[PDB]
Amino acid sequence: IGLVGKKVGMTRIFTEDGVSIPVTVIEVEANRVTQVKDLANDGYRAIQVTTGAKKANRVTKPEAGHFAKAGVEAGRGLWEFRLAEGEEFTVGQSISVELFADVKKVDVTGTSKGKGFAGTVKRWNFRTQDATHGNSLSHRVPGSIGQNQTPGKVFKGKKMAGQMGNERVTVQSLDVVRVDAERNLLLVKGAVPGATGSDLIVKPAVKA
Template sequence: MIGLIGKKMGMTRIFTKDGISIPITVIHFNTIRITQIKTILNDGYNAIQMTTGFKKISRMNKAEIGHFKKAKTEGGYILWEYRLKNYNPENFHVGQKINIDIFKQIVKVDVTGISKGKGFSGTVKKWNFKTQDASHGNSLSHRVPGSIGQNQTPGKVFKGKKMAGQLGNQKITIQNLHIIKLDFIKNLLLIKGAVPGYTGSNVIVKPAIKI
């Protein structure tokens, strides 16, 4: 089953009848249109290309203008593609609009987004390494990682060694998030828990694979 492109609006909370607080993330879905249908015969694989939102013609290049004109749809600000194993051409067509109705019978979803970038970070922040002694003779080595290898044998640092480096700004998928509510009037999806990305970032919401 395909997913939808949404925008993370932020987090809030709701209360149950018993007074229990539930943290939720609000995701808004703009008008989503199919711009291209790819097939094994023409493209080597089955996929559906979609766009969301609206973009002025003055902001698009000629390739984008021609692509949306061929699909006979209004230009969107982003293009996304979903690969399909079992493709039925009768279910989709170019120009078709898709909304959150596809989540009516869905209980859990998987949400994919780009996590917040936090720059170059040390091992304590990035990997939760334990810090060394604050005093008792220790100086200048409070947050250093320590030894990163062994001896003359093997004489190298193994691949995958946890060291300082870029933290965040990665594609992350959070699985099995419960759907709390669907607002068909405002095109909002309320999901229990947090999803990756900053407020205003794009996220992909798909029906959960592992249930």
């Protein structure tokens, strides 16, 4: 199905033979089920979960009630997962990191680090024009953006400067190294999106 978890930086695990494997430490606290959606009401089968612990004055009544229907404590934020026919869950149930004890590889979704207004060189890997040899005010500029009379227009999806990052991106099939049940961790190989403290949706690899 999937679990929500805060990113907690990066480390490495040294395997006894020698290999140091760079790991992302994802803390995965008790993901508790706030709602179960089904074909009768909603037209599709899913579960809504929560995690963390939001202070009571910061949570609003419309959500405070929403948690009181389940009976769970008010976690910081809500996420939904689609069920794969066979599995079935109940409201108020706490899903733990022990689901990933069986799996080998995981898709990790997160929000990428925001680079702000990025130019074409940074954003699209556009090539810098000649740094000298006569060049006039046009070193890192994008160059041409179209043809002439014929279109007489720039085409849609033309790679230009603009907002880079702060976008939801998914890194697929990362190898799970260790699944610590006691501290509630999930060590995956490689790097996943977003900064330390960002929320990650970790789930089993679709590309088996």
